[PDB]
Design a protein around this motif. Structure first.
Motif, short mmCIF file in Angstrom:
data_model
loop_
_atom_site.label_atom_id
_atom_site.label_comp_id
_atom_site.label_asym_id
_atom_site.label_seq_id
_atom_site.Cartn_x
_atom_site.Cartn_y
_atom_site.Cartn_z
N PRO A 86 0.83 -1.20 0.00
CA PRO A 86 0.00 0.00 0.00
C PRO A 86 0.86 1.25 0.00
O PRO A 86 1.93 1.29 0.74
N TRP A 87 0.49 2.16 -0.88
CA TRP A 87 1.11 3.53 -0.93
C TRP A 87 1.29 4.18 0.46
O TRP A 87 2.36 4.74 0.69
N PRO A 88 0.27 4.13 1.34
CA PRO A 88 0.44 4.74 2.70
C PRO A 88 1.64 4.19 3.41
O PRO A 88 2.24 4.93 4.22
N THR A 89 2.01 2.92 3.15
CA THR A 89 3.11 2.34 4.02
C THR A 89 4.45 2.95 3.63
O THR A 89 5.48 2.72 4.36
N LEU A 90 4.48 3.63 2.50
CA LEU A 90 5.71 4.26 1.97
C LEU A 90 5.85 5.75 2.26
O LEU A 90 6.86 6.36 1.97
N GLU A 146 1.90 -12.88 3.07
CA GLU A 146 1.40 -12.69 1.70
C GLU A 146 -0.02 -12.19 1.65
O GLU A 146 -0.41 -11.52 0.70
N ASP A 147 -0.79 -12.56 2.66
CA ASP A 147 -2.19 -12.24 2.77
C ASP A 147 -2.49 -11.20 3.85
O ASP A 147 -3.66 -10.89 4.05
N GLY A 148 -1.46 -10.71 4.58
CA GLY A 148 -1.72 -9.71 5.65
C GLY A 148 -2.24 -8.36 5.13
O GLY A 148 -2.61 -8.23 3.94
N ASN A 149 -2.21 -7.35 6.00
CA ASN A 149 -2.67 -6.01 5.66
C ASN A 149 -1.83 -5.29 4.61
O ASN A 149 -2.36 -4.47 3.87
N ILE A 150 -0.57 -5.68 4.54
CA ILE A 150 0.42 -5.00 3.67
C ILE A 150 0.41 -5.68 2.26
O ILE A 150 -0.11 -5.07 1.30
N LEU A 151 0.90 -6.94 2.17
CA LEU A 151 0.91 -7.67 0.85
C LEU A 151 -0.52 -7.95 0.40
O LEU A 151 -0.79 -8.06 -0.80
N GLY A 152 -1.46 -7.98 1.35
CA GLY A 152 -2.88 -8.16 0.98
C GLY A 152 -3.58 -6.87 0.61
O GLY A 152 -4.83 -6.85 0.46
N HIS A 153 -2.87 -5.73 0.59
CA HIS A 153 -3.57 -4.44 0.27
C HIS A 153 -4.88 -4.16 1.05
O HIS A 153 -5.92 -3.83 0.46
N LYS A 154 -4.83 -4.23 2.37
CA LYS A 154 -6.06 -3.94 3.13
C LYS A 154 -6.02 -2.57 3.83
O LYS A 154 -6.89 -2.27 4.68
N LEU A 155 -5.02 -1.73 3.47
CA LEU A 155 -4.90 -0.42 4.14
C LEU A 155 -5.64 0.63 3.35
O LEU A 155 -5.54 0.68 2.13
N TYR A 206 -6.56 4.36 1.78
CA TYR A 206 -5.77 5.43 1.13
C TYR A 206 -6.02 6.76 1.81
O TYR A 206 -6.71 7.68 1.32
N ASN A 207 -5.39 6.89 2.98
CA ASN A 207 -5.55 8.10 3.74
C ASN A 207 -4.34 8.05 4.70
O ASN A 207 -3.52 7.14 4.62
N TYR A 208 -4.33 9.02 5.60
CA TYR A 208 -3.21 9.26 6.48
C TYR A 208 -3.58 10.16 7.66
O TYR A 208 -4.17 11.22 7.47
N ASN A 209 -3.19 9.71 8.87
CA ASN A 209 -3.42 10.48 10.14
C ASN A 209 -2.19 11.40 10.45
O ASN A 209 -1.10 11.18 9.90
N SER A 210 -2.41 12.47 11.23
CA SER A 210 -1.35 13.37 11.71
C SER A 210 -0.76 12.83 12.95
O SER A 210 -1.42 12.12 13.70
N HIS A 211 0.46 13.24 13.22
CA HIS A 211 1.33 12.44 14.05
C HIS A 211 2.49 13.40 14.45
O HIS A 211 3.09 14.02 13.55
#
Length: 230
Positions: free
Chosen positions: A59-63, A132-141, A143-148
């Protein structure tokens, strides 16, 4: 202060940016290019990233955290705490390990430096132990982003800084995926750098799509302001 003057003077207007990333996550190889500009006077960055090898396998957010803290707005009272600008133009190395809770990790190495008038962020990333099937390789995130807030401390014996922070990525089921970041920066040059008192950077990030863009991509708008030393 002839120091506060130098690296700082590189950032006074709008500075074009280039980002290059080579990625291998669980043997899924991929490459990303980005372009845009920063305006540190306003803590402001505008970037567009393109997967030039096809589909991004994560997922783009993870980058987002991986894809430029030299563009933080430091208040005038805090200019002596700005390690990132002080390292320029020679630049600094930014290393991370990012642990995704109950899933794999990313290990990143970047060099952030000027190439002529362009501020360049060259990145290598390796991810291991992903499901392979988790939130990352499975694309379950989502497309947004929280402040931090991001907490910076001196690392005087490495003549650098350590940064530590947690990102929570929204999952499509309404839950969150924690990504715990451990980060170290060290100047590339032999010269003096500003080593900061403990403070933080406040990040706001907005993810969007270019309507005229057909490749796999991400438009990223970040505002970043130093605080915590009143």
């Amino acid at each position: 202060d002839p120091m506060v003057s130098k690296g700082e003077e590189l950032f006074t207007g709008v500075v074009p940016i280039l980002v290059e990333l080579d990625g291998d996550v669980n043997g899924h190889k991929f490459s990303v290019s980005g372009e845009g500009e920063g305006d540190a006077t306003y803590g402001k960055l505008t970037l567009k990233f393109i997967c030039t090898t096809g589909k991004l396998p994560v997922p783009w957010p993870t980058l987002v955290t991986t894809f430029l803290m030299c563009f933080a707005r430091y208040p005038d009272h805090m200019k002596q705490h700005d390690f990132f600008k002080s390292a320029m133009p020679e630049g600094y190395v930014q290393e991370r390990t990012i642990f995704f809770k109950d899933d794999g990790n990313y290990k990143t190495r970047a060099e952030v430096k000027f190439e002529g008038d362009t501020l360049v962020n060259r990145i290598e990333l390796k991810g291991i132990d992903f499901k392979e099937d988790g939130n990352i390789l499975g694309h379950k995130l989502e497309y947004n982003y929280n402040s931090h807030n991001v907490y910076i401390m001196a690392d005087k014996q490495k003549n650098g800084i350590k940064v530590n922070f947690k990102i929570r990525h929204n999952i499509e089921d309404g839950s969150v995926q924690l990504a715990d970041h451990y980060q170290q920066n060290t100047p590339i040059g032999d010269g003096p750098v500003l080593l900061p008192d403990n403070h933080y950077l406040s990040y706001q990030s907005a993810l969007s799509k270019d309507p005229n863009e057909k490749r796999d991509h991400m438009v990223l708008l970040e505002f970043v302001t130093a605080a915590g030393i009143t």
